[model samples]
Target: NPQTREWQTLSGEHHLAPFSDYKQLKEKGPRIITKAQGVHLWDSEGHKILDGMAGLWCVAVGYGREELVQAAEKQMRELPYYNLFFQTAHPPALELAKAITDVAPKGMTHVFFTGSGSEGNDTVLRMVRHYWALKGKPHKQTIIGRINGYHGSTFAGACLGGMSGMHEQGGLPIPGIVHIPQPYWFGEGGDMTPDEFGVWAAEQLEKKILEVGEDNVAAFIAEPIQGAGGVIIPPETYWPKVKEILARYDILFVADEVICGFGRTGEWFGSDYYDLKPDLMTIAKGLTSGYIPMGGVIVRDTVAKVISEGGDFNHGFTYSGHPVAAAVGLENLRILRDEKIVEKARTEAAPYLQKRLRELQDHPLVGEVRGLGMLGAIELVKDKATRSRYEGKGVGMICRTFCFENGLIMRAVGDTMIIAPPLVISHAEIDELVEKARKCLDLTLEAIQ
Candidate 1:
């Protein structure tokens, strides 16, 4: 116990955790995650917890893949670090780029690497504007995003994302960025049918585009499925309507695939699943299965051609295409492809997972259950018939604490409990995950009642 306290003391005194309340950290400290394997993590207290959030919705291949370890080791032995600048190139970066574009959607033939998804979005913002300006529309500046969508946390990324909380802290959403309502039917649909609300939500995009003047809007960016915003899977009618709107406009489409990419959605990319032909796709998280820090933007050929002609795009990171990160990324892709992990998740795991998660809708506190591929969300509410929340009860947090205490790791987004477990999780592990989730829900209900 002293050893645990030792780590907590270190954190309390020295560490500034991201997106954390300082007082809460000093009071309760953070859970010390020590090691992980497969779909499980062992904390400092030796508790083997199922990693239901997939280490923050990355870790697609799970933990402790010896192949990934070796790839990193080999790369490190040869060249641990280098910059993509200086007009120089390396095998790992070039090869990883080729590997990535090979699986990317048709016409998306290039990538520009970064250290994280946030950086990738930052790149997207700069590159989108630059591309528009290169095509002689410098005033085409604003980028539209969904109300609750998450892109990343960097300054540009924060502005790109639509979280009011994040915006409040930094006086953010700097100029040239705006948001539309998310397609979260259960939470915001009110009296409209899901189909009607879906069309309405899509119309909001057209309205914003017109409000901003389509000529001034540079791009419309969104996650194929909103991950951080409570796993808000759009209504079936949503994407089709949005697609029609995009087709009618000259605005570029940018898909933030940081969460839904690399098989989390049982598709190579969520764009593939949605049949969206985005001009750009910002990617990270699953690119290297979270084994190493790496991210990038997948560029469509048309945009790439314009950007290339612009001559000296004047943007990149110091660690852009770091050799080891690229090596690990390459290996990660090989494993996902060679093992047919994405396909298996599609045919076997996702169907089973979705079915079991929906069964929780019968629970009293569960107002709704929705998911796609391996992503899931359970809306916690007091009146299921009205789809009403408990109002400041912090019910999701209550359930989340029970989950940690009982050895599960689900995330709470307000009152919505969400999960994105590893793609490699077994059927038995899925059973354990769902059983533990139900137990936590039961405990939450008991405490509130």
Candidate 2:
């Protein structure tokens, strides 16, 4: 219609979306998301869509929470943008920082604010290297991450991530970052049991550390549950073994909690759920429930104290602690804690979601069903017994297309269908999402056959 064409034309002419190839986008155009309320979205023609990815793995407290809107407005009236650079500080910043540390992993007592997760990971790059330089170990600059793991898309963050597609485009890695095999047991593990495979996967970090020489390795970073990497839940033995390996070296453990934090995993953090101690954590996405853009690094006191001694560590952003964003973030956290959003996600929504997702495993196309808390995925297979996949992302794309047509928003990574619904999703909504997903799967199977 005239409406769709005009919007697509404008978007095509002027806007270049992130992580998208402009040439491909111009031909295909884009879905113009008009608005969202609660766990649903509406297109230009008012097609209702269930939000299964929680607005890209955030939005814990759900959408259209007036408290968040009022908090942002109130803070904007009092103080708008304020930078943390050059020793400037504001009340929202201080208050938000305190709020973050209050729930952070036991030893993490400081918060370094950033505009988003990408910025937070980039900050991680700076802070980790800075800490080492101050410790008289300037050679300790190499950061190790798992292949297929996502950190962010900034030069440093992208390099920190192990996605080959992102790396191929940017001439990335810029130096001082290395990657090991991901703990993606379903895809990478051959004949070994999950527990046995977890040990082998965890040992890959040791192999890389030794190859690079531990003296040069500053940190081992990972998501508690790899989100963008298709929600690859590590084996039960994975974290414990990885913890032992990292502990064997004099290095920092940085948990990139961008998608795994703020109760998506049913705990205060993935680190807490896994019982792993991290020196620094990358946090964003749900910090403000997507009400506003905000991210930060929750630094363990051990790391901060050493960096503190470095005297003017020399890094920051113009909106390092934008007061309004900070205020909104504070309110978001208050609602998460005070309203018991995270608690409910754990005690109620998470378990119910997993159980329902499990019901999909017997579906003809599903090879495996797995998740932690409210995040879940169903793997599509060509041969369930052999655990085979489609030749490419084709099946996933076809199924995703079917999902949109059927009023559900399920993301497909390769052939894996994933859902990260809002923490506040009701049982009825969960059933609806799964029912839509099953129909979408059937359609995908027919399309492929």
Candidate 3:
């Protein structure tokens, strides 16, 4: 207990956490997570917590993976550091790219590596404009994104993303980037049926295209299923309409697959799940199962051809395709494919998890429960019938505190509590996750009452 307090003191005094209120953090202190195994994390207080969010929506192969560690070890010994620049190449980066292409959606065959999802998106901004320039449409410089969609934390990523809060602090959306409405049926779909709302949401793209003038648009970038924006899955009619709109325009389609790739959606990538043929895919998180920091843009053949023919794209990170990260990524993909993790999650785990998750909807505080594959969300509400939230109560925060204290890890995005457990989670583990979640909900309700 004294040690825990000391660690918290260390965090308060020195550590600056991501997206944290330093004053609040200093007052309440931080939970020091020391180790993880399977889908469980052990904090410095020796509390065993079930990791329902899968280490921030990564960790596909689960924790304590010897194979990944060994891969890193082998590669570190062989060639730990190298750059994919100056026309130089390494086996790990090249081989990982090949492996990635093998599992990527049809026609996406090229990779441009970065150190994280943010960097990958930064690459996307540059690469997309470059592709347009190479295609003789140098004037097509504006990028269209969706409100509440998340890319990452970098400047380019923040600008590309439409999180208004992030935009408020920084002078974001940086010049040529514009935004449209998200197909969030629950939050924004009023009066109309979900199908109608879906169509309306998709139509916003066309309206925005017209407003911006389609010829000046470079690309439309979005997550297949919004992750940080409370796991908002677009309605069934949504993607098809969006696809039609994009087809009518000359703009490129960029899929931000950082959260939805690598079995998070049961499919290899979320684009594949929805059958949206994107020109470029931004990947990270599960690329190395978060065992190593790595991300990239998976370029389709058409886009790749244009960029390839255009000399000196003049964009890259120093750590692009770092050999060790690439090595771990290669091994992670190998495990996913060879072990059939994605297929098993789809056929077995996802169905069971989704069904069990939906059972929570009967709780008084639960307005809705929606999910796909391992990703899930529980909307906290005061009145389920009207879908009314407990205004000013911070109900989701209450539930999330209960989750943490009660040995579970679930994220609260406003009134939505979200989860994305490891793909390798067993049925019994899923049962534990759901049971703990229900208990936390009860605790939250009691606290609010």
Candidate 4:
């Protein structure tokens, strides 16, 4: 039976059952999106809302790109579907694989396809484990990830992620996976400067590697900029120190660029943004501008060669190299390159947005504003002087609900309101986004008071 508050289309009103528990649904309710274009989305009531979170920090080119649609259509007509398995392969997949390798971090010469970021991360876990095993180091099976880092939802991916809530639900970290503290200077910083904190945080990895035993450590995986973990931008010295430690231990470093790849971080990959030298890179999201499901694991030549020597690397998905997805990805890359989207985001749009967002630090509810390129977050604290987050889950929920009601789609990661608008936003759109956010912040302050 449908709940009294359950919303349904006129035609299906009687037949519709509650999507989730009525009590829970009543608070969040049903949100039906009717249309989206560029940086905005329209709900069923035709209310235009700024997509502040960029569809979970993907959608680099924003929504409604006609070229992407056309490319998908053209490929579907030419070759709707094909597999990379067996001896047969499609041109789009083959070409995209080559294109990705050419632009990926220096030594990454091979690409393995997957359906989404989660699966790509899973591929990374499996491949790294296999690599170590191939080298006769079966004991090197432990993977270390930072606390608060978000990888994905698959078994191995979730195990690699550092969110305790997800770990609790899944009973994960599944034996071999371990986590170290994050490089979050804002929340974790006391008297230490960001640079000092960064050095200390980087050392945590080495400490964990030693504790876990270097011989038992398979890989160290992290997002160059922690996206879902509140847009955590590590200090300037962070990555260099991290790289030094990884080199010292001969640890495989995996950069999860699921959110920061394809211009989101103002670079081709976040590794480029942070000056990292990764052994493997997992990318998705903007590969096809979120127009289709596509992801891939980029492997260094040495890693790929070692794995290939084993013969029958023995893993792949049914749609590993879906022709339509590859074609769309290829065209999307062409557009991004020709338009210089990433370069513009890095040199122009990102700086402009960062300057504007920093101006909001004075807001009563705002504890800190941090970002890299288009990825940003405004942390909401109950006490600014002490950096105390509000107790209980509903603390940020009030602000998040107000934002949604006022026509801005942002996400609340604990008490932080995160904003990662599409990479295609213009200067004017950036101002409009800031204006909407200001209004939401004001409302949040009033609600808290």
Q: Give TM per candidate.
A: 0.98, 0.98, 0.98, 0.94
Clashing pairs in 4: none
Deviating ranges (above 4 Å) for candidate 3:
307-309
Any runs in candidate 4 off by more than 4 Å, and if so which?
A: 1-23, 26-28
Tens digits of per-residue lDDT for model 2 on 44-161?
A: 8789999999889988888799998999999898877766776678999899999999988788899988888999999888888888989899989999998999999888888888
Q: How well does candidate 2 score on lDDT at residue 358?
A: 96
lDDT of 1 by residue, 308-424 (tens): 576898899999999999999999999899999999999999999999889998998898998899999999998988889988989999999999999899999999999999998
Count of clashing pairs, candidate 1 = 0
Which ten-residue region of model 3 has the weakest summed lDDT? 166-175
How many residue pairs collide in each prediction?
A: 0, 0, 0, 0
Candidate 3 per-residue lDDT over residues 1-449, each given as its tens digit:
76889989888888999998999999988888999999999998789999998898889999999999999999999898977777899999999999999999889999989888999989889888888888888888999999999988998888888888888877624779999999998888977888999999999999999999888999999999999989998899999999999888899999999999999999999999999999999999999999998899999998887546767778888889999999999999999999999999999999999999999989999999999998999998888777888888888888899999889999999999999999999999999989999999999999978
Q: Indicate the residue-level lDDT of 87 in model 3.
A: 86
Q: On TM-score, who's better, 1 or 4? A: 1
